Amino acid sequence: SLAKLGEMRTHVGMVKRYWNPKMGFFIEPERKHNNDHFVLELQRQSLQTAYNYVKEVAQNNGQILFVGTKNDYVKKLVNNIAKRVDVAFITQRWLGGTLTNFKTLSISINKLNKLVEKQAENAADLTKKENLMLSREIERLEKFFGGVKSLKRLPNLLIVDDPVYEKNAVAEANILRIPVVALCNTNTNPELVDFIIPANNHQPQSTCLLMNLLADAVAEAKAMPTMFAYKPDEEIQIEIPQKQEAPRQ
């Protein structure tokens, strides 16, 4: 129905003996692999819950936000998701306070758009040096605010691919009462994240897979086609910077 258990060929595994012990519910007793494997039925149940929540959120015609900050793969991933589905997203370092305070950044995004249109209408009226300086600042602003530019109010939903590495983002989201869903790997603290998704995020094959199911889940509510979700077999085969070698040092 929704990503049957056969397709999760590589969906469990994390560095040895670094797991937060309060997550004993999801992880079964430890085995030889020493990588805390997850129960796939509860994984599918969590995916169902996230799907049916984000679908209703999109039906409400609100604003949802995407977060990706790890080095290369997740950044390119969220860029692809953004260019495929009309979703707010963040690709660079979280700017420490985007949601908890918004008046001090709404002015910044408004300045970004105003200077973008200033460039669009300026027919080289000023000097070349003046033209070069403004475009450099445009590039600077797009480097940080290229994602969150088409929003007016506080994002009513945000995703995080690694709550531990994004403790700032999840903490800021939890200062308010807005919901947050995270790829809660075995080392995070589940008391903060609202909807827990005990999947693997360090490995490349699983993060792209689950991000794509979530992107199609929000896309189908917009009538758009689902590239990676609900679609059946001989598909969901993602190009792989190969997925092997779970242990880290």
Binding site: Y53, E56, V57, N60, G62, N156, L157, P179, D194
Partner: peptide, 5 residues
């Protein structure tokens, strides 16, 4: 929170 709205 069950459901948004």
């Amino acid at each position: 929170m069950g459901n948004f709205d």
